[PDB]
Design a protein around this nucleic acid. Structure first.
Lengths: 71, 141, 124, 140, 104
RNA sequence: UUCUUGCCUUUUACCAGAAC
RNA sequence: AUUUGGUCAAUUUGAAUACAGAGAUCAGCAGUUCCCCUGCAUAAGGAUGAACCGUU
RNA sequence: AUCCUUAUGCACGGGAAAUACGCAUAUCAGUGAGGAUUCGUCCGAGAUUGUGUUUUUGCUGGUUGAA
């Protein structure tokens, strides 16, 4: 919960980003379960690269951020 | 035997197949439960629930969809935007193009009596100017 | 917490292994989801081992399968989660029973055998 | 239908209706509530209206009540409909020889829809007139 | 809205004859062929290059990864075999190297 | 107005007969 | 025996101008889905090879 | 370290189809959807409803005309 509080906006988009990250870490079976995402975050931790890919995923999973930037 | 049950045969014939299927599985489940139970337990709550569920299912099947809000005709604008082609795309569109032989057929020679074909279903058919004059005079193609 | 009559419940790692096997089995068309299919498999003799769900409620719809297995001498487990089992099988819906079936010429034969052995060990 | 199609109350309302639909076309049935032909027309238009909601709006009008618009037909007063777009009255040449209004029931729903579409198209172009795809001549 | 790249038509040796966006298609016929064939090669090469890159990166990861993974073993499977003789070198070697491989 | 003829295809207006 | 089914729209009007009403045609490529092959990765799971002795 | 099986992810390449492919705060679904049958039994995963496009989406090139 603490972890979620600090870095994680804990919406659907964030979850998606997290999922993507684990796939890029090198997943096969759907990464891991998420009770409140904390577990997932913990699992990711071994990879040790969280904050970059969510700032990338919003540019892709919609293009709204990109549009904003343009404007 | 099951199909002749009250549980199926009360509902409309629309539902009977699905209803019957439902019954089979639920019946099986009930049987299993019975097998599991020791003598002098007579729980029979699960069965009740199943029955209720079955009833609900039946009701749902009998009830139809609520009326559709009549889908509107699109604001008639007459756009010719597309403009495409591609070995890919031109195939599909080939299926909907009139092909060259059909075009030829659609052409009718002016003075001449045009080549028909006597389909036994209907003689009407105009083979048109798809057959070359000389060719037509001689035979087929 | 899981039902007492759901026995033998597989240990975490073991459960995971079983799930993996099932997934492999699903891929290979070696697996048969569901009570009724599982039952059929048992009748046939094709079943290698039967994987059940502890969180099947009402549990007693399940509890014939174990008996059948016992009478057929087929290893059987429960895993804890029906949902998980379903996922493994390749079904978003809750599956409660499954059968990994026999097929000598499978790639995953060895895996299946291992799981069977594990299941047997569990039983007593 | 009475319940389905909105009916208008007084000439002002009618005028407003005619003006306000910038995007859509406006079909005003002018007709005496209890008449056969008028009723038939209303029934037809009910069907059409839902279909063509996206391009044309239908409204009804009791012509004996709202006497403001006996400019529109020179005091002949059969059971009519009228067509409008951007407050400009829309002329539709049928066989009838009254190009201004269709003063005759058409039985085909689809046909009616088609004619509505045609007039909408004409309006969009700006063409005050439009030639209908159906000849009529017989109904009148 | 970005215009960061521009998408060029993916020629091949079958499209070769029908693509005219890139010029020289009959004018410089062998040149055109070279261009198209070259393009194809690049595409193929790119694919191969990508694969190579992937292979490299994976390899890089694996060494690091193994080092990282000093997990706490919960329970250990064991097997004890006994034999009457092994005056064969080969068998001994097999026993060694396999063991080394499997962290056994 | 309704039914039957004939213009025919519609408005009249008719063709030529019944019924109210 | 007569007649109705026959009004161009648009613009400028307080009848004149208009005069039928305002992109076409040929061709790429990419995407979408499914399939097949191929190389790589990821998991899993095999199968197998390699001289010779090792570690308190 | 080499070879292979499975699934998936990315891609070279080749092929077919788009009457197809989605979408849903829907309803139901391996606790059985839908089907087979030689009638003994067998297969076992979508079905329903709503709806969006669907003679096509996104991009290019040419000739042309326009004049």
């Amino acid at each position: 919960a603490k972890s979620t509080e600090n870095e994680i906006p804990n919406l659907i988009e964030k979850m998606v980003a997290k999922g993507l990250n684990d796939l890029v870490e090198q997943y096969k079976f759907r990464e891991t379960t998420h009770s409140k995402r904390e577990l997932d975050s913990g699992d990711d931790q071994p990879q040790s690269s969280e904050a970059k890919r969510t700032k990338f995923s919003n540019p892709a999973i919609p293009p709204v951020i990109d549009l904003e930037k343009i404007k | 035997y099951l199909f002749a049950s009250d549980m199926i045969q009360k509902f409309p014939v629309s539902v009977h197949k699905q209803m019957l299927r439902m019954l089979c599985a639920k019946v099986s489940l009930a049987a299993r439960v019975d097998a599991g139970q020791k003598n002098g337990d007579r729980n029979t709550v699960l069965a009740h629930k199943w029955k209720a569920e079955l009833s609900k299912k039946a009701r749902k099947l009998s009830e139809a969809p609520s009326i559709s809000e009549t889908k509107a005709l699109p604001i008639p604008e007459d756009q010719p935007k597309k403009k495409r082609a591609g070995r890919k795309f031109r195939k599909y569109k080939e299926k909907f193009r009139l092909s060259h032989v059909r075009q030829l057929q659609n052409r009718m020679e002016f003075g001449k009596q045009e080549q028909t074909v006597l389909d036994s279903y209907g003689e009407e058919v105009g083979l048109g100017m798809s057959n070359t004059s000389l060719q037509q005079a001689v035979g087929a193609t | 917490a899981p039902n007492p009559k759901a026995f033998p419940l597989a240990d975490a790692a073991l459960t995971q292994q079983i799930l993996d096997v099932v997934q492999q089995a699903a891929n290979l068309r070696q697996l048969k989801k569901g009570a009724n299919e599982a039952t059929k498999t048992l009748n046939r003799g094709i079943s290698e081992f039967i994987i059940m769900a502890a969180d099947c409620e009402p549990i007693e719809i399940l509890l014939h399968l174990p008996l059948l297995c016992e009478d057929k001498n087929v290893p059987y487990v429960f895993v804890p989660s029906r949902v998980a089992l379903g996922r493994a099988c390749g079904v978003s819906r809750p599956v409660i029973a499954a059968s990994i079936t026999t097929n000598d010429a499978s790639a995953i034969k060895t895996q299946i055998y291992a799981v069977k052995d594990k299941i047997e060990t569990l039983l007593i | 239908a009475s319940v389905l199609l909105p009916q208008l109350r007084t000439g002002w309302h009618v005028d407003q209706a005619i003006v306000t639909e910038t995007k859509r076309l406006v079909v005003i049935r002018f007709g005496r509530k209890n008449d056969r032909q008028c009723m038939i027309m209303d029934e037809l238009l009910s069907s059409i209206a839902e279909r063509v909601r996206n391009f044309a709006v239908i409204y009804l009008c009791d012509i004996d009540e709202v006497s403001d618009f006996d400019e529109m037909y020179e005091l002949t007063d059969p059971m009519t409909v009228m067509f409008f777009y951007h407050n400009k009255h829309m002329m539709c040449d049928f066989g009838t020889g009254n190009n201004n209004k269709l003063n005759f029931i058409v039985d085909d729903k689809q046909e009616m829809i088609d004619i509505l579409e045609t007039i909408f198209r004409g309006a969009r172009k700006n063409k005050g007139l439009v030639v209908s795809p159906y000849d009529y001549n017989h109904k009148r | 809205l970005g215009l960061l790249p521009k998408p060029e038509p993916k020629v091949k040796l079958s499209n070769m004859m029908s693509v005219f966006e890139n010029d020289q298609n009959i004018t410089d016929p062998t040149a055109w062929e070279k261009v198209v064939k070259d393009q194809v090669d690049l595409r193929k090469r790119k694919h191969l290059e990508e694969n190579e890159r992937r292979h490299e990166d994976a390899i890089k990861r694996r060494k690091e990864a193994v080092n990282m993974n000093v997990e706490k073993p919960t329970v250990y499977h064991c097997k004890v075999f006994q034999f009457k003789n092994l005056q064969n070198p080969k068998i001994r070697f097999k026993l060694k190297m396999n063991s080394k491989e499997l962290s056994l």
